[PDB]
Each structure stands twice: as C-alpha cells, then as structure tokens.
Design a protein around this ligand. Structure first.
Ligand SMILES: CC1=C(C(=O)O)N[C@@H]([C@@H](C=O)NC(=O)Cc2cccs2)SC1
Length: 258
C-alpha cells in the first residue's frame, strides 16, 4: 500500500509498471489501466522514425511554416526560416517535448494511423495513436484514443531501446537523446540516486495527466524499464511532479536497488 498511500496523498490515480531486465522481476500497480499517453508517445514515434530511415536519411531537411507550429514549440519556433533536419526534430521532440517537432515527424512517417500500424508490427496492440497536437492531449475518462498503459509503454520502450526493433547504432541515438532530456529532472530522475544514468520522456495532458517513462541503469546490473502514469478526477486538475518522484522511490526499494 505505498502506491495506495501516494494516490491518497496526491488525490490521483497511479499506473506503475517496472521491469528489471536482469532478473525479469516486475513491480505493478494498475499496470493495465489506460491513461492518455501525452508526450511519452514522442519516444515511440522516434523509435518508428529510426526504424524506417538510415542514420544518414535523418539528414533530410524539413521545410515548415508558422502554420505547422502549435501550442508549444520551444525549438521549432526558432528555425522556421532555415527548416530543421529529421535528426534535429527528433532531438527537439525528445529533449524539449517540442510538440510541433512531434507533428512534423508524425507527418514524415505517414501520420497517427501509420504510427499505430508500426506499433502493432512491433507487438504493441494497446497504444492507440489517433490525433496530432494539440488535440491528442484532450482525452476524457473512459475514452481510448491517444491512450496506452504502463505495461505497454514499458514493453514498447524496451523493444526499441534495448531489444531488436532497432540496430545498435539507432538504439544508441534514441538512448542518448532520452538520457539528455531537459524536461524530466523533477519526475523519475528525482526518485533515483544522483549518478545513475536515466533515459526518460515526460508528458502532461488533460485531467491533470502527468507521465514519465524511463530506462534506469543501476551502477552495475542490467537496466530497469519503468512507466509512471498518473491522472486526476477533474478536467482542469493541476498535477504534482513529486507524485512521480515518490512512486519512483517506491519502485527502486521494491526492486532492492536502493
Ligand atoms: C510540460 C509539457 C510536456 C512534458 O512535460 O513533457 N510536454 C508537452 C505536451 C506533452 O506532454 N503537453 C502538452 O502539450 C499539453 C499540456 C499539459 C499541461 C500543460 S500543456 S508540452 C507540456
């Protein structure tokens, strides 16, 4: 009941799945409960992009205009005049959660419907991409569009980053981007001792949805893959990062890593 206690303290619903890739030991709490995936989808999106292109092909330059910019464009809003390469867009999407970058990448891989088809091909029957930004943040309780589960996001992040859905050079690019994420310092990273390498992707959406998916490398040992998803009862609810940090501390204890 440490997970239950956190739902009580933060008045939120929590979805946890963690897999120690070294022992196949698992920590779960509502692991199959749907949540809006929010920006966590960006990680899986770069997965599919990497699978479909050579590394050299990421050097294709994408021209775009103000009309491709949406509600949060911290990198893309600076380079309308020059455009950005696919590699630069992958960096913006993963490290800054640039929503226009995600939309431009989605367009290059054939849109939300194409992304869905490529996720089913890697064995993910759960994650349901259907819309672009900004609409994908808008998910009402009980709806399944743009939702996933903690178990499915772990299984899929692991498949791309650590297994055989990508060749080693592409896994390395994806892991490196996620390792240098700038948006995650208050979430999973804040539940993990300084010095352990962490790769993560955050998200936030309606109903106070607040998510983080990560790979954690304990000093030595095989890594852990973790999803912490959360949501609240009201549409305009605020979230609290500290719920994710605290849930992460619980996982690390339950796995005897701290
Ligand atoms: C703060 C934030 C993140 C993140 O932390 O990863 N990613 C982008 C996106 C996906 O989560 N969120 C939105 O665009 C919708 C919003 C929810 C709360 C503020 S904006 S923009 C909002």
């Amino acid at each position: 009941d440490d997970f239950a206690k956190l739902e009580e303290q933060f008045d939120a619903k929590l979805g946890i799945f963690a897999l120690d890739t070294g022992t196949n030991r698992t920590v779960a709490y509502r692991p199959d409960e749907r949540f809006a995936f929010a920006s966590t989808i960006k990680a899986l999106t770069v997965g599919v992009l990497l699978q479909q292109k050579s590394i050299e092909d990421l050097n294709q330059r994408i021209t775009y205009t103000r009309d491709d910019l949406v509600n949060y464009n911290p990198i893309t809003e600076k380079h309308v005049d020059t455009g950005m390469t696919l590699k630069e867009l992958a960096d913006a999407s993963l490290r800054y959660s640039d929503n226009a970058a995600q939309n431009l990448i989605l367009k290059q891989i054939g849109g939300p419907e194409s992304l869905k088809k490529e996720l089913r091909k890697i064995g993910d029957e759960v994650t349901n991409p259907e819309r672009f930004y900004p609409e994908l943040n808008e998910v009402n309780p009980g709806e399944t569009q743009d939702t996933s589960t903690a178990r499915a996001l772990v299984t899929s992040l692991r498949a791309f980053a650590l297994e055989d859905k990508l060749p080693s050079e592409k896994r390395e690019l994806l892991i490196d981007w996620m390792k240098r994420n700038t948006t995650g310092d208050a979430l999973i990273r804040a539940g993990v001792p300084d010095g352990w390498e962490v790769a993560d992707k955050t998200g936030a959406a309606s109903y106070g949805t607040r998510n983080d998916i990560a790979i954690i490398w304990p000093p030595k040992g095989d890594p852990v893959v973790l999803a912490v998803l959360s949501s609240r009862d009201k549409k305009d609810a605020k979230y609290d990062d500290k719920l994710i940090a605290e849930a992460t501390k619980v996982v690390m204890k339950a796995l005897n890593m701290n």
